């Protein structure tokens, strides 16, 4: 997460280690996102960095507009499949993995977000909150 995120996030179960591919959920022209890193993640011998809902990851676009492809850009995870747990005591999960491509500040590339978005993410990145429909 880090730069440009207003607020702090409570720890949520890590669902997306490096190499995972998630649906691109905005209108930017990208079909998917290949995660090459997670911002703010730490270090342990052999451990894969993993992303959770609301995190900022570095990514490449595997399927999509050729102008988007062959380059590394920031993106924000807006949906998880792996069950996580909130402090209100519920274990919940979405039906897919999805994120939206963004600049380091947290500002979005595309004008809209298709599908639901997790509130943990909406609270974290204001620009995502803007462009979102149903939340949680």
């Amino acid at each position: 997460s880090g730069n440009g995120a207003q607020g702090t996030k409570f720890r949520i179960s890590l669902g997306l280690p490096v190499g995972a591919i998630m649906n691109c959920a905005d209108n930017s022209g990208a079909r998917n996102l290949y995660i090459i890193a997670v911002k703010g993640s730490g270090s342990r011998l052999n451990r894969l960095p993993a992303a959770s809902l609301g995190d900022m990851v570095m990514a490449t676009v595997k399927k999509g507009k050729p102008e988007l492809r062959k380059k590394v850009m920031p993106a924000i995870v807006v949906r998880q499949a792996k069950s996580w747990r909130r402090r209100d005591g519920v274990f919940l999960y979405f039906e897919d993995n999805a994120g939206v491509i963004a600049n380091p500040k947290g500002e979005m590339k595309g004008s809209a977000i298709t599908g639901p978005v997790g509130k943990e993410c909406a609270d974290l990145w204001p620009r995502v909150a803007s462009n979102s429909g149903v939340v949680v």
């Binding site: 607020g7 702090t8 409570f10 402090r87 209100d88 005591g89 609270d123």
Partner: protein, 48 residues
């Protein structure tokens, strides 16, 4: 004895869950009254 779950309102100014409910695990230990059968005095010595 065992554990169970609790629901309570959290009072923690500044936290995202301030004034919100949280659900928490707790244990339960069975504690019938203890009974007093004696006293031991202890003195200090250079050996303890």
């Amino acid at each position: 004895a065992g554990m169970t779950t609790i629901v309570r309102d959290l009072d923690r100014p500044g936290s995202k869950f301030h004034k919100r409910e949280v659900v928490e695990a707790v244990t339960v230990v069975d504690t019938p009254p203890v009974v007093v059968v004696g006293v031991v005095g202890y003195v200090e010595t250079p050996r303890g």
